[PDB]
Amino acid sequence: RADFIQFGAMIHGVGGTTDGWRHPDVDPSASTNIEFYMKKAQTAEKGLFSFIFIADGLFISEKSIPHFLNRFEPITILSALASVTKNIGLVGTFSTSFTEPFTISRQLMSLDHISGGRAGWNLVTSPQEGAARNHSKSNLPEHTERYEIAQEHLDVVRGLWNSWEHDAFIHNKKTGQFFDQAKLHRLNHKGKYFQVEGPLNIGRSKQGEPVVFQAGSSETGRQFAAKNADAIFTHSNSLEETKAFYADVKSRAADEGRDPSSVRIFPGISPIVADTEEEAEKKYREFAELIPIENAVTYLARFFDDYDLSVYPLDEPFPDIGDVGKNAFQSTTDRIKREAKARNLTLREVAQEMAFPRTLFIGTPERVASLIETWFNAEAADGFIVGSDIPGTLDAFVEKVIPILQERGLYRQDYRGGTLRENLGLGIPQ
Amino acid sequence: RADFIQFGAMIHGVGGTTDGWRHPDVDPSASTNIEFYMKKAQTAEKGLFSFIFIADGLFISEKSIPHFLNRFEPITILSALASVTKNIGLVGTFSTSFTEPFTISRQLMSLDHISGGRAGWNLVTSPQEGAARNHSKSNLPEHTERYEIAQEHLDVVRGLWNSWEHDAFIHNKKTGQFFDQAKLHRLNHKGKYFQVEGPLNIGRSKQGEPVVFQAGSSETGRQFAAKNADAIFTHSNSLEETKAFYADVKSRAADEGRDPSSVRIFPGISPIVADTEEEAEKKYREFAELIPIENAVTYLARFFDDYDLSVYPLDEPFPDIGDVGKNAFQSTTDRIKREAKARNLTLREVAQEMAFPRTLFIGTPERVASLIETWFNAEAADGFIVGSDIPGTLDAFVEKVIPILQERGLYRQDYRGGTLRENLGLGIPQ
């Protein structure tokens, strides 16, 4: 391909699982540990990653995963990371549901100035229902209305970012003209959900304004992202599904009058790289074995409801149970039955793999680089957002996979520039 | 006195005046210049200052002073400064009028974790009226209602900060107990202005929770600050007025059932320190002369409305105009008349001094240290918040005034600790 592949690094504290933090290598305080976040950010920058990504959440219970219980908030951790990094982008999740767009617009643009033009906004339209009750609302608006709110919120945020033209600040000490008043613009916005006069009290950044990311998956969300986003996150459940998503979103973007190459699609992967196939599998198994087996069998039991799995000896082959019946997730049960037979899995192993599935992107650096190249050449991805919950995985990826991609001409030898737009290959608007 | 005096440093970009940025020494981009903010923060830390302070604003027009037009937002710049400082506090202005307390609570507590327990909140109840129209409101609530909103907002913020007990996170890998569920508390708040279920998704910091600052000056604001604040900002218009403010607020705090020593009162000063009296006066005059004289005479004309000041030659003594009449600011006009006669000021000089008054805290390091000691011993101040708009003033203060205060036993030789509470002399609540 003519362009280069890009990577982002999701920094996610003690990770996305219930029990991964119990591994001997995991620092259980990682989610509020500034050293952990700084070290991961600098590892990603060493790998020339275009950005780091901080997810977010606004509602928890006693059953939330450990990372969700106690974690940094995104604009603060990204601003702190700006001071100890140089070129890597800083992408944070903020919802359109609660905060006023003037506040979000200021905070993102301020990060964009602090960082020299590296800010990005992952826009979330639909938080958990319970989040409404943390923000003085009885309930969230309905799906359709949440996307109308999000469109108006984003329009106001981008309108405010353009309050000042890029050359508005003359700073002429001799004449006393600090700014050119013809280059200052009030928004004067009076919409259904927001009324915002302006102007914003911060000007254009070195990349013009922050980059917008979105992870819309529904019909409505795919269309919203194709209309509005610079980059789109998606899943990597299969090459076929991701290829279909990519083609659909790129087509929708053309329908909206955009150049499809200006929308960069980033599936999420969590690769497990080791020097040998067996070593990588051993690392996967160490983490899959952390789940309390009774919890995994109980969750497995949801797909074989007509049986008590407790009578089956754990360390014997998975039973030829399953029959047919009919459950809302029955095609799941036949994939489970087929995999268990294909690899002669025990009941314990089936339970463990269901609680923590094995990534396709597992094995030698050469295999993982080749898979990544294949997805890139197949137009399933313009890049990947790399998770690294298992300790050492980001370091292994940067040290071992990146040099192969560089040697094959798919990855740059150094940063293209100092702004997120430049490193993603986007133009800067004014 | 038995305690030590403390200082904060207000970092304020190109400063608080209309024309100070035109001085040859001022960087006119300072207000969005990360290097400027980092250098000032590190100078204050060199001086063992207990905190830096970032003011804020939420509404501008073409006539706003240059710093207000284009400036960092506080939580972002404070988080960026956390990474490049060690012990100094990080105090930011946020209003209770627009943002939900869950958001403010998270962002402040996240800064408190990033920084190791150095966050502070300057709580503003009453922003400019125009700010309402930047946040989807027709108008701000009335004075009384703004303070009721602020009380409920603060109560929710502090309630959320106590969602987790300080020892809630067990992190027991062997048992799988990440937290003690008996040490997690929902707020379940249902008030007039806010409804917030909780819990917050971040735990206690190394100082428990952030410190609250307030600058209430009205009867209502003084009472609100005495009830709620750990530290209070005020003006330094005269020793007598500041002494009266100090005694009043300390008495109100005792009325609210608090130990008055747990409320630290910080008047604001902008000292101009030089090796000689004449050198310091020369620096003052360089900045006072920057104002376009027609603008200063026009503003001066508001106190002598029954005369055209344009007929009076600029460089002759100030005219014996003024008579009596009666204007809402007439006692001002007699102070002006009396000063102009006392120092034989020209019309130009009177205009310049009105546009930019000369601080009492001007002159040699020995004079400025002695004045500061006098205000401290007179119980006008527990410390001062130091402005340094004139380039070099913070450096001169740190290099020349601080060592005198240390030699006289009024200032520590090193930081008391790494948290803002410790350095202010406050206890930590749990």
UniProtKB/Swiss-Prot annotation, chains A, B:
Role noted for this protein: Involved in a cysteine salvage pathway from S-alkylcysteine. Catalyzes the C-S bond cleavage in N-acetyl-S-benzyl-L-cysteine sulfoxide leading to N-acetyl-S-hydroxy-L-cysteine and benzaldehyde. This pathway is likely important in the catabolism of alkylated cysteine generated by proteolysis of alkylated glutathione formed in the detoxification of a wide range of electrophiles. Has much less efficient activity with N-acetyl-S-methyl-L-cysteine sulfoxide as substrate.
Assembly description: Homodimer.
Keyword Flavoprotein set for record: yes
Lineage, opening ranks: Bacteria, Bacillati, Bacillota, Bacilli, Bacillales
Uppermost EC category: oxidoreductase
Functional pathway: Amino-acid metabolism
Full protein name: N-acetyl-S-alkylcysteine sulfoxide monooxygenase
EC number from the UniProt entry: 1.14.14.-
Gene disruption: observed consequences: Reduced growth with methionine or methionine sulfoxide as unique source of sulfur.
Induction trigger: Induced when methionine is the sulfur source, but not by sulfate.
